[PDB]
From Swiss-Prot, chains B, E:
Similarity annotation: Belongs to the GSP F family.
Annotated GO biological process: protein secretion by the type II secretion system
Keywords, alphabetical: Cell inner membrane, Cell membrane, Membrane, Transmembrane, Transmembrane helix
Protein name: Type IV pilus assembly protein PilC
GO cellular component: plasma membrane
Membrane topology field: Multi-pass membrane protein
Localization (cell): Cell inner membrane
Keyword Glycoprotein annotated: no
The protein's assembly and partners: Homotetramer. Interacts with PilB.
From Swiss-Prot, chain D:
Residues of the full protein shown: 74 to 283 of 566
Oligomer and partners: Homohexamer. Interacts with PilC. Interacts with PilM.
Entry text on domains: The ATP-binding site is essential for assembly of pili.
The protein, known as: Type IV pilus assembly ATPase PilB
Organism: Myxococcus xanthus (strain DK1622)
Task performed by this protein: ATPase component of the type IV pilus (T4P) that plays a role in surface and host cell adhesion, colonization, biofilm maturation, virulence, and twitching, a form of surface-associated motility facilitated by cycles of extension, adhesion, and retraction of T4P fibers. Acts as a molecular motor to provide the energy that is required for biogenesis of the pilus and the extrusion of substrates generated in the cytoplasm. PilB ATPase activity is also essential for T4P extension while antagonist PilT ATPase activity is required for T4P retraction.
Family: Belongs to the GSP E family.
Location in or out of the cell: Cytoplasm
Gene disruption phenotype: Deletion mutants show complete loss of T4P-dependent motility since they did not assemble T4P. PilB and PilT double mutant also lack T4P-dependent motility.
Length: 452, 314, 52, 203, 314
């Protein structure tokens, strides 16, 4: 950083903070003051790029002063994520005492560099976002090639992967310590992306959505009761949907909403995404050199009443899953696809038959994203798998609920009460009916009240 | 009458047991794996017999007692001390370090009276002989005396040259004994030895059937060099996040282009065990062969000789 | 630059006075040494004269 | 473990047994005694988690605090499964004569540590089971991380296998000497099981 | 002022050019390949500059003229004679053999007028000077005469010592000259040198982009040892028939188990180029280590000196 005299910075409450693309970045509290700006233009002889900042933050930076950082970087005990953030931070403060001998609490940037849609398309392109109310808007954040590359490795690494010219695209997930997740697509160099490196982030933010999401109009209360039922007698279900229609959220919602306190549940994920407020539960995560099948195969082995597979992507695990369904477990999982040939095709192509999946799969929800300009809508577009047919086309499917987008409504389409009868008896069937019509937003509390 | 096994071959096998046992594999399964990865029959054959006693329920110390000509009383007692105190893992690590120091020390006396002994006398006095030879070419040289002085004074004045000869000796001895500010730039990083050990350990746990990620979590706790431990924690963190093993390695200079290209083939073939075993044996043989250990000799060789000649000259 | 200038309006009465004081202390050290040396020289000339 | 004076533990028959998630685990025989509880709250200054235990078991733990065991452990001739249980037991009795010079017959614990569904899901989680008539029920048995890890190796070893961070999951079978079998799934550390090590047993 | 390059480093590079050019690659592509396979920068840097002149259309001789401190007038003229007569391939083979003989001869004086000439005068008379100078310490030594004899008789009696000096000379000359029925059992087979050359040549043509079979057909015409040429014709015939490269090699004793096992990885990995480059570097360094050519010097060095001194005393 450089200004004219330190006194001038303090008097005018402005501070240069970099030089990029022949221009001096100047953080300025009073950008309407043409006298001060023209004074800086004349005294530096440099073309300016103005950035507005809060007065006291500028003053603080003037007195504090990319150098203090150039040294705190060579401190391995800082980047280490194995260390709790609470302590790590302390080291950065005490280490910063080196220069001026105080503790600075809350260095915004020093922390900002150590500790619903973000579109980052190329080099020197302003980031775009999807705002909860404003939708697609441009942003005041741009990175040239060097900064892009640095972001790109940053995000890649925090998501746990190693993007390079050898492996230029990367479709991972960031786990925010607040347990929250986000889907990250990312590209290094320009080999796939001529416009330069680039990244996209579809933010989750979690702590997991509940059945309180008949607020969000996604699934009608009636259908959620039918699923509540369904999940109690161990009907197996797969949530299908195109990318980011809500598969994982919906799944986690259905398991979370049920009282699972009296049943042993039992989950296998490539990374954590599933939060459950339940005690009898074993959470299992793929580690180095393990296939999904290793964990499912060895897990079905114990006695799970319910098995949750984050998402079927090696179908050698898929196979174990539908096998689990045929012994009579309650299995649930997610699949990337948009309709019935999508899934069935997708499921059959590592060697499970539709007799085994469709015959032992009970229900298949289909999730969507509907957009009407700036509303962001996630809806269950629609599916009861009856079984197989001898001499056939196979997959016998009875569509219970469709979603009409024109009126944003869920219609019942030829489902009858005689369909969902599938009960071992009269008292069981009666219990289903009561839950049908007879059967607080936080997951902990919601689970708490489905428990009862 | 039976002999032991080579210093090399005890080394490899004690290292690879210490590694597997510290991984939390069952001792019998550790034993099976090193037998099944062995290249010499006599090793694979013994280790099946040691394992056969361990599956009857005997301690490792008592099972090795079937080969007292290979594992001496001091070795078994170290094992048995580890077994009695609940520290079998840390005494096997100690024994592996011991066996490694023993093999290295063996190669390194013997290497070059054999040939090494005859060449080492011969190099240690070559120069100091040349020196006494040029200083015996008559009288009234640079720095001498006339012969008529009293002997004690003559010998004391030359003390300069007697000293320049001894220093010449000490130097060529040092080269024969050794030899068989950016603060981070000054730290010892990974060597050839440390890469060979890593590769053997991983080749070993993969050939046994452990996944890559289970092998890396064990290895990251049993790596001796701190900078490599930091490297391997980063490799394991990257792989556990879903990055491809060859890509976590390619970020670190210690893995050549080929180690990475070879590992990258192993990922796509399901043959990482075979790949790592052949990488490790290539490295172990490169290690035991090991060029700067000979150039720096010669630097001090002629440099000291010349320092003597200049010394009296002046 | 003015923050330093009002640090200069608050304090350096004290600092200027102090500097003057350290200087006058040094000069008094110097003149006391410059009266001790003629003592020694004088005892010396005594010892010469008496020897004459 | 820590309490106030040893005398106070013995008088009130309570014993702290761990500290987890800012709370002091206190094993207590008379959890209805608000006077004793409030005395412990004030004297320790720590928030309590109460665990009910049988009076004599608490007293026994207070006085031990597992020594007689800390020595009988260093007796290889005990753990050895190659030896018939009938004789092994004898050694443990005679060896126990060291302290007081009797034979104790049937040390419950000394034996309990040398010689239809059990769900053990994570650290500091109460075990669940499937009862022949009652089905899924919670249990009064919990293990913190250290005890979990120890169980976990115990079961792993008796089933004949070596679970470790290198081989974190394990699907073996225990052979009870009564020719009876049981299926054991098991996980060490947290690498595949974030909730900690864990085991299940379908008897 | 600029220096040349090491004898080793001229060697490697002249060999690998002779090899590529005799393969029928374009001269510029030969140049690119050896630059791109080089380990020292100064070599890769020059060879890019020599290639830059060749792509402007200059002869190799005229392109090497940009480095007269590295390629002397005699080297360029050999190249230019090859270019003028249409024999660039066979003069580069000659130059590669020349550079190999030059490096070997260098290591082998120095080990234990250039440096070789100055060191070889200096070693050949060191001792015989010592000798003349002990025998010049006064009169009435062991075996002398009194100075008053007639000169011819004095000189003839000492003939003993004049003889012990000449023998000392002949010996150190022999060490410097040497040192730089089953009929088939008697033929010289492949050595370490010949395997190192083979491996370098193949590592070289594969790294450049030639297939295995094109590289083997070139190599089978440029192999010096006849038994190896017969071996390599059999390896190429086997591979061209569809047998796997490691399996044609495994039939021939000259390829160790490690070589074959390493090549067998390289086949499944598409990394043979580099497997061969690392094999070749390992061999080239094993070759240049291979040490008895210097110990036996010293045996005859001091052994003869001491024989002289003993000779007259008696």
């Amino acid at each position: 950083i450089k200004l004219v005299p330190k006194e001038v910075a303090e008097k005018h409450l402005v501070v240069p903070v970099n030089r990029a693309g022949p221009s001096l970045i100047v953080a300025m509290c009073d950008p309407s003051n043409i006298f001060a700006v023209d004074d800086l233009k004349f005294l530096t002889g440099y073309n300016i790029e103005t950035v507005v900042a809060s007065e006291v933050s500028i003053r603080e930076a003037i007195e504090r002063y990319k150098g203090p950082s150039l040294e705190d970087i060579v401190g391995d005990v800082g980047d280490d994520i194995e260390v709790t953030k609470e302590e790590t931070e302390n080291i950065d403060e005490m280490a910063k005492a080196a220069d001026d001998a105080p503790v600075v609490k809350l260095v915004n940037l020093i922390l900002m560099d150590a500790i619903s849609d973000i579109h980052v398309e190329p080099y020197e392109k302003d980031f775009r976002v999807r705002f909860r109310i404003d939708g697609v808007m441009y942003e005041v954040m741009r990175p040239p090639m060097k900064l892009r590359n640095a972001i790109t490795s940053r995000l890649k690494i925090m998501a746990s992967l190693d993007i390079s010219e050898r492996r230029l695209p990367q479709d991972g997930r960031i786990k925010i310590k607040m347990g929250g997740g986000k889907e990250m697509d990312f590209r290094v160099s320009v080999c796939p992306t001529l416009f330069g490196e680039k990244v996209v982030m579809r933010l989750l933010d979690k702590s997991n959505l509940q059945l309180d999401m008949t607020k969000l109009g996604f699934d009608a209360q009636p259908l959620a009761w039918f699923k509540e039922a369904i999940d109690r007698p161990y009907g197996m279900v797969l949530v299908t949907g195109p990318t980011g229609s809500g598969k994982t959220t919906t799944l986690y919602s259905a398991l979370s909403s049920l009282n699972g306190l009296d049943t042993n549940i039992c989950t296998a994920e490539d990374p954590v995404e599933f939060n459950f407020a339940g005690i009898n539960q074993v959470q299992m995560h793929d580690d180095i050199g393990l296939n999904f099948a290793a964990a499912l195969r060895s897990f079905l082995r114990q006695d799970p009443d319910i098995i949750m597979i984050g998402e079927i992507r090696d179908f050698e695990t898929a196979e174990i899953g539908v096998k689990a369904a045929l012994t009579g477990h309650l299995v649930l999982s997610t699949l990337h696809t948009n309709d019935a040939p999508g899934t069935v095709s997708r499921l059959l192509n590592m060697g499970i038959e539709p007799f085994l999946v469709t015959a032992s799969l009970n229900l298949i929800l289909a999730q969507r994203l509907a957009r009407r300009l700036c509303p962001a809508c996630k809806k269950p577009a629609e599916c009861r798998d009856c079984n197989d047919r001898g001499y056939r086309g196979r997959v016998a499917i009875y569509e219970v609920m469709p979603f009409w987008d024109g009126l944003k409504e869920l219609v019942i389409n030829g489902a009858s009460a005689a369909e969902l009868k599938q009960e071992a008896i009269r008292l069981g069937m009666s219990s289903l009916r009561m839950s049908g019509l007879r059967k607080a937003t936080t997951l902990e509390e919601v689970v708490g009240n489905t428990a009862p | 009458g039976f002999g032991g096994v080579e210093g090399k071959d005890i080394l490899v096998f004690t290292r690879q047991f210490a590694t597997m046992i510290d991984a939390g594999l069952p001792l019998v399964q550790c034993l099976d794996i090193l037998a099944s990865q062995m290249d010499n029959p006599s090793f694979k054959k013994v280790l099946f017999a040691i394992k056969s006693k361990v599956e009857q329920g005997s301690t490792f110390a008592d099972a090795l007692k079937e080969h007292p000509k290979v594992f001496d009383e001091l070795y078994v007692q170290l094992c048995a001390a580890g077994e009695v105190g609940g520290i079998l893992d840390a005494i096997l690590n100690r024994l592996a370090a011991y066996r490694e120091k023993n093999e290295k020390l063996k190669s390194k006396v013997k290497s070059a009276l054999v040939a090494i002994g005859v060449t080492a006398v011969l190099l240690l006095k070559v120069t100091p002989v040349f020196e006494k030879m040029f200083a015996d070419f008559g009288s009234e040289l640079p720095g001498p005396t006339q012969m008529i002085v009293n002997f004690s004074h003559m010998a004391q004045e030359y003390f300069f040259h007697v000293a320049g000869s001894i220093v010449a000796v000490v130097m060529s001895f040092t080269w024969s004994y050794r030899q068989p500010l950016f603060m981070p730039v000054f730290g010892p990083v990974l060597r050839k030895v440390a890469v060979a050990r890593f590769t053997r350990t991983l080749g070993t746990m993969i050939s046994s059937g452990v996944p890559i990620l289970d092998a890396l979590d064990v290895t990251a706790k049993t790596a001796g060099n701190r900078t490599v431990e930091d490297a391997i924690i980063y490799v394991r963190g990257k792989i556990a996040e879903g990055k491809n093993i060859a890509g976590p390695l390619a970020e670190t200079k210690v893995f050549p282009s080929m180690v990475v290209q070879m590992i990258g083939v192993g990922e796509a073939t399901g043959a990482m065990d075979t790949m790592l075993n052949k990488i490790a044996d290539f490295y172990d043989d490169e290690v035991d062969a090991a060029a700067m250990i000979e150039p720096v000799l010669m630097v001090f060789l002629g440099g000291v000789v010349g320092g003597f000649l200049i010394g009296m000259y002046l | 630059m003015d923050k330093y200038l009002d640090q200069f309006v608050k304090a350096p009465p004290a600092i200027k006075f102090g500097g003057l004081a350290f200087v006058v202390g040094a000069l008094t050290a110097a003149n006391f040494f410059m009266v001790i040396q003629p003592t020694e020289e004088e005892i010396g000339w005594a010892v010469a004269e008496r020897r004459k």
